[PDB]
Amino acid sequence: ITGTSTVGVGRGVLGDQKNINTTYSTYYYLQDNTRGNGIFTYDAKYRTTLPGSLWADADNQFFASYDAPAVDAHYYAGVTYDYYKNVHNRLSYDGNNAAIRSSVHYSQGYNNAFWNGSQMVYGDGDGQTFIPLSGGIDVVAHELTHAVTDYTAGLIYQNESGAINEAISDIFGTLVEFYANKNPDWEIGEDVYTPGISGDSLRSMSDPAKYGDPDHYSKRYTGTQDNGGVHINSGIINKAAYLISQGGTHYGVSVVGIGRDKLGKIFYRALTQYLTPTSNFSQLRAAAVQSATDLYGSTSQEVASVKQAFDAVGVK
Numbered sequence: 001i002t003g004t005s006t007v008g009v010g011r012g013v014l015g016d017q018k019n020i021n022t023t024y025s026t027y028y029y030l031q032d033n034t035r036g037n038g039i040f041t042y043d044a045k046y047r048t049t050l051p052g053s054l055w056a057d058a059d060n061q062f063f064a065s066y067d068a069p070a071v072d073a074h075y076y077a078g079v080t081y082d083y084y085k086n087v088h089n090r091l092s093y094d095g096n097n098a099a100i101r102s103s104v105h106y107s108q109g110y111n112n113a114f115w116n117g118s119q120m121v122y123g124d125g126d127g128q129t130f131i132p133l134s135g136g137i138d139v140v141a142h143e144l145t146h147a148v149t150d151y152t153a154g155l156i157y158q159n160e161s162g163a164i165n166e167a168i169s170d171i172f173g174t175l176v177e178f179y180a181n182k183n184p185d186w187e188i189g190e191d192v193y194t195p196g197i198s199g200d201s202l203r204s205m206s207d208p209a210k211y212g213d214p215d216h217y218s219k220r221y222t223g224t225q226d227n228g229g230v231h232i233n234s235g236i237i238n239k240a241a242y243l244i245s246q247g248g249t250h251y252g253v254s255v256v257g258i259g260r261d262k263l264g265k266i267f268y269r270a271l272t273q274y275l276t277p278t279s280n281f282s283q284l285r286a287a288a289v290q291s292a293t294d295l296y297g298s299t300s301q302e303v304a305s306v307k308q309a310f311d312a313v314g315v316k
């Protein structure tokens with residue numbers, strides 16, 4: 001909408017106060033004009049018709065319980081935009097400052113979040129498996145990263161390419177969580193998963209097997225559930241990425257860690273210059289090796305560590 005840029009204040013899903021960029025024209029809207037061609041947050045009103053209504057508020061204060069998922073979807077989309085622009089010189093998901101749209105309060109008891117081809121969509125959860133999913137910065141960044149993937153490598157959402165697609169979203173979701181630097185970890189969704197159980201998470205990148213996901217290619221899922229295991233076999237790539245950054249010895253193979261920033265540079269370059277819609281895990285290894293070679297040189301520690309990490313997870 002046309003209006004003037006304003007700054008509201010509210011409370012997110014976890015109860016934390018934050019400032020949000022809004023737009024005033026009769027109402028205060030969740031429309032942040034400070035980033036690209038805007039970040040827009042919508043109310044789906046417990047229904048499934050999208051996007052719903054651009055979020056309107058009478059007073060620019062967002063402290064109601066109903067407001068909390070919108071506050072966080074809006075704010076964490078801003079952090080994710082900043083990460084891509086400041087760290088990778090990428091302007092929004094399309095590289096040309098496309099408007100970023102999110103809807104919250106999608107459906108009833110909805111234990112998921114997704115990119116629908118055009119926008120991000122967040123359930124509220126059922127209060128048992130999830131609380132409103134936009135409360136996780138890693139979740140928000142995971143969702144926006146699906147848009148980045150779709151505009152770049154285009155990894156088809158099934159089988160190995162789909163597991164790479166998933167892992168890319170978990171990797172960058174985690175790197176955004178570290179960028180914001182509030183309780184960062186290598187776990188996925190811990191802030192919004194299972195409010196009655198402390199210390200768990202939906203997935204672990206450092207130890208995927210803790211939640212039943214494979215940490216070696218010999219343990220990959222080959223059935224048809226979950227689009228051929230896209231949220232399962234992502235553990236193999238998530239573990240490789242964790243090892244590249246943090247190091248470790250895994251199934252007897254030692255990896256020298258090179259840190260998160262270099263992990264992000266390598267995987268961003270692979271995603272945007274080498275991967276294709278049909279890339280498989282072996283092709284991801286080759287893309288990561290070539291990316292590290294471009295950035296750091298063929299004789300570099302970084303190249304050697306990429307090779308060690310893929311060896312450790314059984315991907316040649």
Ligand SMILES: CC(C)C[C@H](NP(=O)(O)CNC(=O)OCc1ccccc1)C(=O)NC[C@H](C)C(C)(C)C
Nearest residue numbers: 111112113114115116117133139142143189202231
């Ligand atoms: C980070 C996490 C909290 C949320 C993430 N959502 P996502 O991966 O973005 C789901 N997306 C999806 O299924 O898209 C299908 C599609 C394809 C095309 C158009 C529209 C939709 C996820 O890991 N979901 C997995 C869920 C919870 C289980 C039950 C399988 C474990």
Ligand SMILES: [Ca+2]
Nearest residue numbers: 057059061062
């Ligand atoms: Ca208000």
Ligand SMILES: [Ca+2]
Nearest residue numbers: 183184185190
């Ligand atoms: Ca965390």
Ligand SMILES: [Ca+2]
Nearest residue numbers: 138187188189
């Ligand atoms: Ca996390």
Ligand SMILES: [Ca+2]
Nearest residue numbers: 193194195197
């Ligand atoms: Ca929990």
Ligand SMILES: [Zn+2]
Nearest residue numbers: 142146166169
């Ligand atoms: Zn995903």
